[PDB]
Design a protein around this nucleic acid. Structure first.
Ligand SMILES: [Mg+2]
Ligand SMILES: [Mg+2]
Ligand SMILES: [Zn+2]
Length: 1207
RNA sequence: AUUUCUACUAUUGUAGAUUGGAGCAACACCUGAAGAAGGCU
RNA sequence: AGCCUUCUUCAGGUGUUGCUUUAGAAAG
DNA sequence: TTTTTTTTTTT
DNA sequence: AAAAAAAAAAA
């Protein structure tokens, strides 16, 4: 029943909030009762916030780091000179894996640590820890120095720009090196490592340690931090802090990913490759790769993806993961690290058949090279040889191409046409050589003429003849250079897409998409989980949430820096139960913590376990069967009862009061049941109180007080209107259903120059990115990791979709549901028709409009809504859901109200239309102009020569830019925007032709934000209509996956193939490319399906489509069968075949119809016309007004008719 | 005016949408280079 | 010797379509 | 039952 | 109507 529509999946959600107070006069003041401390903390945070320059900076930082490393390497073992603070000693005892003991001094000299722990002196653990850090940072110094010297010699010679390393690996190698160096430098500069025994005079023999004890390490710290902040700033946001609200997580160690690393290495079959390839030299590994059968190894799915990759295209292993990986796999296997590094450097060594034939023609073989490499060489050199003598192995190339295609390639009309076009291009290039004209141009003119008159086309190209006439007219008579250049460019576009199109080669390239994607995926995951080893400090701050009497909420976070004192303790000791400010913490527990408590207990003779409080006296603990046999020992009942006893009756359970979580392990007969109970129940929002004097003492001690701000929690009247603010106020009810994750990150965005302080981009914006979790409390819920496991397997995903829509169809079978069909297009971006379950068209939708009403008291100005129309089948293009001032949710047509030409002009009239597809049309025109600025810059600059009028400027654009493809041609061209762009380009070129300034103009504007925002309006409409029918509905969509024919690109005139010609061609993306990147079909699908899986009803999440992550999780699903029409059920959403939805009569169901010039549907076999809307018909067929209405009606009707038979 | 996006208003704002961080793969063009082939003077 | 076109490769930038990983306490 | 054409759109 | 042609479904 209705419980089939509740959510059983755990969901993560990021709720970003502002952390900077806007101080305008048109912004309501908030956070007033701690405003002085907020200002103090903001001044404190503002102080410590921010390829040739980057690498000069990297060289200086590298030299300073090497100097520090060489000096520190001779001093770390000097226990008679080094001392540590007490809190730094406690953190060291955690990090170096020894027991701190009891210390009665505030400054603990390492000479005083003569006590023996587990067979070694206490200071020997510290010295061994520093030696291990020195070794690790020495390795990463070598690794970073290699890349730095490579990229330096690349920049210092102009001839070596092809030798630059990958920038991502350069940045990440420096980040690891910076972490390892900072591990020593930050305590040294903080004073946590000091040299107290130095005041005595030993300058004649101890000058090195005296010099090192004073170096002002804050300078090296600042340089490292500056480079770190430069690297970490992506998208305008720089990471600032990582704050935790659970203080048991503040001293977190890096997570160990050894099982995932081993599994990924096992998937790569990397160990077998190193075994077969070690002992070989570099030329011997090259010979091994040369002797492979490329085609059979490429199609053998049981090979390494590394080997399968190297036999289509050369792809080296990335630098950082290769150096981490060789060191990881060498020492366990008994191998030398240099030998395995030599093996990994030789994988993907790029080799050129043209170069190899140039140097030595004997022993040459095209079978030595990858398929794409040898194909490119053979194809290009065979195409040239049809008209001239070319130094290349002709018979070998012919055999190679014939073996791929199964026919004689040099006789194929496609290859012959390619060779003809290439010969024409060559002779034109001879005639165009302005530096050196030929002395006898008639030879090349006659060559071009004879080549054009002898071309046999392999297929029909309608515009080839006019290109031929333009080129021939310019070379013979010289009429018009513009049409000649356009024809030459279009023949270049024709020639470019001609290569490989004689289906086997397309199949191989489509396979390489998946193969190289798997290769990159696995190496990126391995790189990410190797970097975690050196992520020593993960939590930077410990914080609490503070609330005052006005419900303004703050974050008070203390930095966990190495000092004399404990910071977690200095906050926790200032909380009372009788003070004036409310405080919140997260008290929680996970199975992730439980496994770390279980597996890391030590039961040896001399050791003192950090986890001895968790472990009781029951018999279930066996260290050998926990370390070596965990997956088999965890299914024993003795371990289950031991873990239950540890969770119920241990010292940790009684000190931390785990009885407050309300666990019940009586029905838990497994370890996984215990995990599920802990994950479902272990959350509390712990409320204490703090005083203003305590906050005052903490803020001058270095704590940061940040306000938590969004638009409607800091407004005058503070009703929650966004879903984020409703979620935010739902967290502080303390329920387990909706949780606050204890860990979150703080970032900042520096202001953009040219923006006022009144707008957010002229302001230093701090952002707190809180994470919320939806954990279902009603039964067996499904966690995030299980979801990731299911999304990676397509068969499990198919089974899950099948069972989900089985429950869905059972729930709705006997109810009076409706079917909502949505058509998609360009004239109407979406059209919506609701059908009764017997097929009757439903709908008397009230369509509203807005007027802004100025009030006498100016703060009381508001919008008023009046009903404008009544519509049955809805064009969703210009509609949006609005809440009126009375609180009623209505449908408003945004196009019925005019907007103002200039913003913030209250006394001006509104005169401009507000159609939403015109926005997409204008952005497409802007992107087309930018593309032509990149490729045809002089043709773009010629549009504004003699200061043309708007009409002449329009007709000059039409010879350069193609039309949008819907409506009248060039109907809404953004003339004033485009002319300003061309003027700015002309200004930049006149000021010295700087490339960065040009890139700020000619690079394509992103289309995703605009069409996401436009789609979101229609998604809100569909959610409103779905809620209107009490969620008893099915949604019917077209399966727009197949392209029936070709298209032309929106950027060039370039041909786009069909799905029959290239199996990976999608109709939605072909339509996207035709519109120069402004198609909204897939955005509509993805946003609708993401809306339908997390629908809110005021406290509860309702799920209507199955769980999915990627686009291949709702695509690639089973089809419903034994039905009238083909359909793919995805929950309540059905994807029907789009065939004969627009070309069908609503009355007689015949397909001999046509759409009139006004998009009126006319039937040629029964006289039906959509213009006769006053003649009432059965099933409200007279509601259909267009061909889009007809398409939406038939989209709904196919799903209606197969839902009748299906249930 | 915004956590942010889209459309607005000038209402100490309004309406809808909103899961963030780091990346990987293919394609398009631009910029900096290299190798090869053929051609011109 | 100077230069041109063509093909391929390397690095980056910007777009377009996709796909992963990460997001609660680690002693042999 | 075979076969061709069907989602998009304009001049 | 067209338009470098596959699987679904009209005749
Ligand atoms: Mg449609
Ligand atoms: Mg349509
Ligand atoms: Zn009819």
């Amino acid at each position: 029943m209705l419980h089939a529509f509740t959510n059983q999946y755990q969901l993560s959600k990021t709720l970003r909030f502002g952390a900077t107070l806007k101080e305008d006069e048109k912004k309501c003041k908030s956070h007033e009762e701690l405003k002085g401390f907020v200002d103090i903390s903001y001044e404190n945070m503002k102080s410590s916030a921010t390829e040739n320059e980057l690498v000069k900076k990297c060289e200086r930082c590298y030299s300073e780091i090497v100097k520090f490393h060489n000096a520190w390497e001779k001093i770390y073992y000097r226990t008679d000179q080094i001392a540590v603070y007490k809190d730094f000693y406690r953190q060291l005892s955690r990090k170096a894996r020894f027991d701190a003991g009891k210390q009665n001094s505030q400054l603990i000299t390492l000479a005083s640590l003569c006590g023996m722990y587990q067979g070694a002196k206490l200071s020997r653990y510290i010295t061994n820890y520093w030696k291990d850090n020195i070794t690790r940072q020495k390795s990463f110094l070598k690794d970073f120095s290699q890349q730095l010297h490579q990229y330096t010699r690349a920049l210092e010679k102009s001839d070596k720009a092809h030798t630059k390393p990958n920038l991502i690996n350069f940045n990440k190698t420096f980040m690891v090196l910076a972490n390892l160096v900072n591990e020593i430098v930050i305590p040294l500069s903080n004073g946590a490592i000091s040299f107290p025994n130095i005041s005595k005079l030993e300058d004649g023999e101890e000058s090195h340690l005296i010099e090192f004890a004073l170096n002002d390490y804050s300078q090296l710290s600042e340089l490292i931090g500056e480079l770190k902040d430069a690297i970490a700033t992506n998208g305008g946001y720089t990471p600032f802090a990582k704050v935790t609200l659970n203080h048991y997580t503040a001293e977190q160690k890096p997570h160990v990913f050894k099982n995932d690393i081993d599994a990924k290495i096992r998937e790569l079959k990397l160990i077998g490759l190193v075994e077969t390839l070690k002992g070989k030299s570099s030329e011997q590994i090259e010979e091994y790769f040369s002797n492979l059968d490329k085609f059979s190894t490429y199609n053998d799915r049981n090979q390494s993806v590394i080997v399968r990759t190297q036999c289509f295209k050369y792809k080296p292993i990335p630098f950082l993961v290769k150096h981490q990986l060789a060191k990881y796999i060498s020492e366990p296997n008994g191998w030398d690290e240099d030998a395995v590094a030599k093996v990994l450097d030789a994988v993907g060594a790029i080799r050129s058949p043209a170069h190899d034939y140039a140097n030595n023609q004997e022993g040459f073989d095209l079978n030595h090279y990858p398929i794409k490499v040898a194909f490119d060489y053979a194809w290009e050199q065979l195409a040239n040889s049809l008209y001239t003598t070319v130094t290349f192995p002709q018979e070998m190339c012919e055999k190679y191409l014939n073996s791929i295609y199964g026919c004689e390639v040099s006789k194929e009309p496609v290859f012959k046409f390619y060779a003809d076009l290439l010969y024409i291009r060559k002779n034109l290039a001879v005639l165009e050589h302005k530096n050196n004209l030929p002395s006898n141009q008639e030879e090349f003119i006659c060559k071009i003429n004879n080549t054009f008159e002898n071309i046999v086309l392999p297929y029909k190209i309608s515009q080839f003849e006019t290109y031929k006439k333009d080129i021939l007219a310019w070379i013979n008579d010289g009429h018009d250079h513009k049409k000649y250049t356009d024809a030459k460019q279009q023949l270049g576009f024709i020639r470019g897409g001609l290569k490989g199109r004689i289906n086997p080669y397309t199949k191989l390239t489509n396979e390489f998409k998946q193969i190289s994607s798997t290769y990159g995926k696995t190496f990126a995951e391995l790189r990410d989980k190797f970097k975690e080893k050196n992520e020593i400090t993960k939590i930077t701050h410990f914080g609490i949430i503070i609330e005052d009497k006005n419900r303004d909420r703050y974050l008070l976070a203390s930095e966990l820096k190495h000092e004399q004192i404990n910071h977690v303790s200095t906050i926790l000791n200032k909380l009372d139960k009788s003070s004036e400010f409310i405080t919140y913490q997260v008290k929680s527990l996970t199975s992730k913590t439980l496994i770390k408590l279980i597996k890391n207990h030590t039961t040896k003779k001399g050791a003192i376990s950090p986890y001895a409080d968790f472990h009781t006296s029951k018999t279930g603990f066996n260290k050998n069967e926990i370390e070596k046999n965990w997956d088999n020992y965890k299914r024993e009942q003795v371990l289950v009862e031991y873990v239950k006893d540890c969770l119920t009756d241990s010292t940790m359970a009684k000190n931390q009061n785990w009885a407050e979580f309300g666990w019940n392990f009586e029905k838990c007969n497994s370890y996984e049941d215990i995990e599920h109970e802990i994950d479902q129940k272990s959350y509390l929002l712990q409320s204490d109180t703090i005083s203003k004097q305590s906050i005052a003492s903490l803020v001058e001690g270095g704590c940061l007080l940040l306000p938590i701000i969004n638009q409607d929690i800091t407004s005058k009247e503070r009703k929650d209107k966004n879903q984020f603010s409703k979620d935010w106020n739902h967290i502080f009810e303390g329920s387990k259903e909706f949780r606050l994750h204890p860990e979150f990150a703080v970032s900042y965005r520096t202001p953009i120059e040219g923006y006022p302080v009144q707008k957010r981009y002229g302001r230093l914006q701090f952002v707190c990115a809180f994470n919320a979790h939806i954990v279902p409390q009603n039964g067996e819920f499904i966690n995030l990791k299980k979801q990731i496991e299911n999304f990676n397997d397509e068969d499990v995903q198919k089974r899950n979709v099948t069972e989900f829509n089985k429950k869905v169809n059972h729930a709705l079978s006997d109810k009076e549901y409706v079917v909502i069909g949505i058509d998609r297009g360009l004239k109407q971006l979406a059209t919506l028709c609701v059908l009764d379950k017997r097929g009757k068209i439903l709908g008397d939708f009230e369509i509203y409009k807005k007027e802004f009403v100025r009030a006498e008291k100016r703060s009381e100005s508001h919008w008023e809504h009046t009903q404008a129309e009544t519509r049955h089948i809805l064009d969703l293009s210009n509609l949006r859901v609005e809440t009126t001032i009375e609180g009623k949710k209505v449908l408003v047509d945004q196009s019925l109200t005019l907007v103002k030409k200039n913003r913030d002009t209250p006394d001006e009239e509104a005169t401009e239309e507000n159609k939403q597809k015109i926005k997409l049309k204008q952005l497409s025109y802007i992107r087309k102009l930018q593309h032509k600025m990149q490729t045809n810059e002089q043709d773009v600059l010629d549009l504004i020569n003699n200061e043309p009028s708007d009409e002449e400027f329009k007709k000059r654009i039409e010879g350069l830019i193609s039309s949008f493809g819907e409506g009248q041609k060039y109907a809404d061209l953004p003339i004033n925007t485009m002319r300003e762009m061309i003027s700015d380009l002309q200004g930049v070129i006149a000021r010295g032709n700087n490339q960065t300034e040009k890139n700020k103009i000619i690079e394509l504007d992103a289309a995703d934000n605009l069409k996401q925002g436009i789609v979101a309006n229609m998604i809100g409409i569909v959610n409103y209509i779905f809620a209107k029918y009490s969620y008893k509905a099915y949604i019917s969509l077209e399966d727009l996956s197949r392209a029936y024919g070709g298209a032309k690109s929106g950027y060039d005139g370039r041909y786009l193939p069909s799905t029959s010609q290239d199996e990976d061609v999608d109709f939605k993306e072909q339509q996207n490319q035709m519109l120069a990147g402004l198609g909204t079909y897939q955005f509509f699908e993805m946003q609708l399906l993401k809306k339908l899986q997390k629908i809110q009803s005021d406290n509860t999440v309702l799920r209507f489509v199955p769980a999915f992550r990627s686009a291949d999780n709702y695509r690639n699903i089973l089809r419903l069968e034994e039905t009238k029409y083909k359909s793919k059920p995805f929950g309540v959403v059905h994807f029907i075949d789009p065939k004969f939805t627009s070309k069908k009569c609503p009355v007689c169901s015949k397909t001999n119809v046509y759409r009139d010039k006004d998009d009126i549907l006319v039937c040629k076999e029964c006289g039906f016309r959509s213009d006769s809307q006053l003649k009432e018909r059965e099933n409200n067929i007279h509601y259909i007004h267009n061909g889009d209405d007809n398409g939406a009606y038939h989209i709904a009707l196919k799903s209606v008719e197969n839902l009748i038979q299906m249930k």
